[PDB]
Specification:
This is part of a larger assembly, with 1 copy of chain A, 2 copies of chain B, 1 copy of chain C, 1 copy of chain D and 1 copy of chain F. By secondary structure, chain A is mostly helical. Chain A contains 2 helices and no strands. Chain A has helices spanning 17-23, 25-30. Chain C is mainly alpha-helical. The chains are: A mainly alpha, B alpha+beta, C mainly alpha, D mainly alpha, F alpha+beta. Chains in contact: A-C, B-C, B-E, B-F, C-D, C-E, E-F. Chain A: One of its GO terms (biological process) is proteasome assembly.
């Protein structure tokens, strides 16, 4: 299984990205 | 058929008109070996059982020392004992001490139920004490555990 | 003290994996690398940290004296095997394995474990030494001892002592038995948590129930999940103890969403900041996002995504790009419409999916049958 | 202890009334259900969502 | 049975509190029980009995 | 024609057959059987009889003169003891008994409850009981 079995995703950018969007312009001025 | 293969206690078929031995039927089981006294790897208590410490020392000096020291008995010229009798109120270390002793003496533990299910075929007891001892002679250095029932 | 020896792995992973971003935790590990650890790995951190000064002085000075205290009862057995009992008695290494497995380094402590495996055939001390060896495998992240000896721990000594030793085989969770596959085996073993009171291992039983409620989210959506986590006395008791994790659970069970995303960020605050982040928690965060979108998308045939944004939080274009990734990934079966802001879902009826599964399984079976037919009779 | 019992009986009678009113319809509007139950659209919507879930 | 065949016999008393707790700990092995049962409290809970 | 002869061998069924109990099987189409007349026999078995129907000493039918195994009865034929029928219910209600709830509830959970919940004994380790013996002063 090594460390992640198989598949997954290698975008290397999705790390609480919704929280970054909420931080992006203060959630787009809280839309 | 052949004479030599005919043994005591094997089922045979007799013909209808004149009783001649037709065919030896196969036997079903030896009754004592079917219900055979189960040999276990002895799961001891690792001797933590407090309160019976006097009983621990007594069972040590009484039964363990002949197994571990044949040289001491041979040098002193003392005949090694064969059996050990235990008595008391029930539940107070009947079977537990035997298991702990058997595991600590590096021997297998054999328990004989043998109360009345054996004696249903009246003389099976006369073979029960036979074949059991045969296995206890052929398996390993071991002990035999037997209950009140013989006095019964 | 091999049962408290897991302090080695516990605090050594409490620093050594987050030591890339741990300042005070270095000082925390300072009075435990020297004062109470196994052996020469107390140096080892100089390959990552500074050169070290003082640990060269004292740690050798005790250890040879401890080797001078290692005559101990060995010579007392040499003058105590004069009794002809078993050519042995319970005085020597069999009663001295605590030092040689607690202070022994694994390059020699593995041989010490083998030495005290050549021991009495009592199942209790044997099972204890195997659990000690499993923890010693978890000391250095060997990932082979915790594979090999776990089969021995679960199956080979399974002839007695059961139904009360089984709360010590709970180490097979987070170990090589349960890797980053935070799923049915791991959550099933974690859901057998019929206990409140501590039994060492991972410490701090609140952390155990947070691990159980974290694996419960990836375990089941709601097939009888309300009985097993929501309707339980002790789990609700520790949920009364821990408020934010209770918020994380109840923002999903009540289907409130929105604030659930905030709780996810809070979970992010300890998703990787614990010791167990050398495998990644991406297969947990993405699985939780897909699970939340699946429970929202159920019971809504033609849902406008303007409603979906206010239901989940913010990010209309974020909702669009997230669904554009997840639909074409293969999960979350729906068909988003870019114009008219509708996210229309389609679900296969249960005759077509069954038809495809029968066709595929029958194809592989007929191929196997034809291969077996070609093997015999030329 | 009448608070939790009354809230629970309120919820069970809510879902019993909602399953009672919905038997004749097949494709009703949620506005008619909301007007007949004298509650807002949002609580009705989330309650039916929880009922399907 | 005394000459040669059998030998010395060992008595057994009614059990004390320590042997009672040991018997209780032995017989609670094959049972799915809670931790923290405090079997010593159960041992002092009843005054005296057999095994 | 074999299917004709398979039906044709059923002449030996006839009607006045004695009833016995099968015991053990020796070889193919030949086994021992215990007649209820008292004696024990070693008979031949017809090939028409399937071997599925014999195991736990089931009741079988034997020939009169030849004394060979011919027929297999339904699994209870001779028992000489019948069930509690349907008109033999002795019409005593549960609520007719007063003040026995400490043992009415105990005997209810010891009879019908482990029909369903049998796995709960194995995951705890009680080794579920088979019998229960009542006693007390006479009346």
């Amino acid at each position: 299984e090594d460390n992640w079995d198989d598949d997954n995703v290698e975008d290397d950018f999705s790390n609480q990205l919704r929280a970054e969007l909420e931080k992006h312009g203060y959630k787009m001025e809280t839309s | 058929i052949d004479i030599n293969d005919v043994t005591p206690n094997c089922r045979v078929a007799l013909r209808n008109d004149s009783y001649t031995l037709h065919k030896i039927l196969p036997n079903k089981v030896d009754p004592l070996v079917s219900l055979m006294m189960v040999e276990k790897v002895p799961d001891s208590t690792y001797e933590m059982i407090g309160g019976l410490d006097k009983q621990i020392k007594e069972i040590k000096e009484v039964i363990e020392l002949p197994v571990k020291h044949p040289e001491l008995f041979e040098a002193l010229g003392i005949a090694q004992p064969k059996g050990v009798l235990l008595y008391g109120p029930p539940g107070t270390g009947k079977t537990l001490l035997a298991r702990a002793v058997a595991h600590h003496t590096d021997c297998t533990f054999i328990r004989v139920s043998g109360s009345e299910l054996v004696q249903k075929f009246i003389g099976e007891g006369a073979r029960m004490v036979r074949e059991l001892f045969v296995m206890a002679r052929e398996h390993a250095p071991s002990i035999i555990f037997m209950d009140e029932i013989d006095s019964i | 003290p091999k049962n408290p020896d897991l302090r080695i792995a516990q605090l050594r992973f409490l620093l050594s994996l987050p030591e890339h971003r741990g300042d005070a935790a270095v000082r925390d590990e300072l009075m435990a690398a020297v004062r109470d650890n196994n052996m020469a790995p107390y140096y080892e951190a100089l390959c990552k940290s500074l050169d070290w000064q003082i640990d060269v002085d004292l740690l050798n000075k005790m250890k040879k004296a401890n080797e001078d205290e290692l005559k101990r009862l060995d010579e007392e057995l040499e003058d105590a095997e004069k009794n002809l009992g078993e050519s042995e008695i319970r005085d020597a290494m069999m009663a001295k394995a605590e030092y040689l497995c607690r202070i022994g380094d694994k390059e020699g402590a593995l041989t010490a474990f083998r030495k005290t495996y050549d021991k009495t055939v009592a199942l209790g001390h044997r099972l204890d030494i195997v659990f000690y060896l499993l923890r010693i495998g978890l000391f250095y992240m060997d990932n082979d001892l915790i594979t090999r000896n776990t089969e021995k721990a679960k199956s080979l000594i399974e002839e007695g002592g059961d139904w009360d030793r089984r709360n010590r085989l709970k180490v097979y969770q987070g170990l090589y038995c349960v890797a980053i596959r935070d799923f049915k085996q791991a959550a099933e073993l974690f859901l057998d948590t019929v206990s409140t009171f501590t039994s060492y291992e991972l410490m701090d039983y609140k952390t155990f129930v947070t691990y159980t409620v974290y694996v419960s989210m990836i375990a089941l959506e709601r097939p009888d999940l309300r009985e097993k986590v929501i309707k339980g006395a002790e789990i609700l008791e520790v949920l009364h103890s821990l408020p934010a994790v209770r918020q994380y659970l109840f923002s999903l069970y009540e289907c409130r969403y929105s604030v659930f995303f905030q709780s996810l960020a809070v979970v992010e605050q300890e998703m990787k900041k614990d010791w167990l982040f050398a495998p990644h928690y991406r297969y947990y965060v993405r699985e939780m996002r897909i699970h939340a979108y699946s429970q929202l998308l159920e019971s809504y045939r033609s849902l406008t995504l303007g409603y979906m944004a206010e239901a989940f939080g913010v990010g209309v274009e974020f909702i669009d790009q997230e669904l554009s990734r997840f639909i074409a990934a293969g999960r979350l079966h729906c068909k988003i419409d870019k114009v008219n802001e509708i996210v229309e879902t389609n679900r296969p009826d249960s005759k077509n999916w069954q038809y495809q599964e029968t066709i595929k399984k029958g194809d592989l079976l007929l191929n196997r049958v034809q291969k077996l037919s070609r093997v015999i009779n030329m | 202890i009448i608070s939790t019992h009354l809230a629970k009986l309120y919820d069970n009678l809510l879902e019993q009334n909602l399953i009672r009113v919905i038997e004749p319809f097949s494709r009703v509007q949620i506005e008619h259900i909301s007007s007949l139950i004298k509650l807002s659209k949002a609580d009705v919507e989330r309650k039916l969502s929880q009922m399907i879930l | 049975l005394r000459p040669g065949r059998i030998d010395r016999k060992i008595e057994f008393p009614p059990p004390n509190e320590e042997a009672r707790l040991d018997i209780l700990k032995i017989h609670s092995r094959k049972m799915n029980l809670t931790r923290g049962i405090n079997l010593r409290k159960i041992a002092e809970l009843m005054p005296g009995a057999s095994g | 024609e074999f299917l004709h002869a398979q039906e044709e061998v059923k002449r030996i069924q006839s009607i006045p057959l004695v009833i016995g109990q099968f015991l053990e099987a020796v070889d193919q189409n030949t086994a021992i059987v215990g007649s209820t007349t008292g004696s024990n026999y070693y008979v031949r078995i017809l090939s028409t009889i399937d071997r599925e129907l014999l195991k736990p000493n089931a009741s079988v039918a034997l020939h009169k003169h030849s004394n060979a195994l011919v027929d297999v009865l339904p699994p209870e034929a001779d028992s000489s003891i019948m069930m509690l029928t349907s008109d033999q219910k002795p019409d005593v209600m549960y609520a007719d008994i007063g003040g026995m709830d400490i043992q009415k509830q105990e005997v209810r959970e010891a009879v019908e409850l482990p029909l369903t919940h049998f796995e709960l004994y194995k995951q705890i380790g009680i080794d579920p009981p088979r019998g229960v013996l009542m006693y007390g002063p006479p009346g």
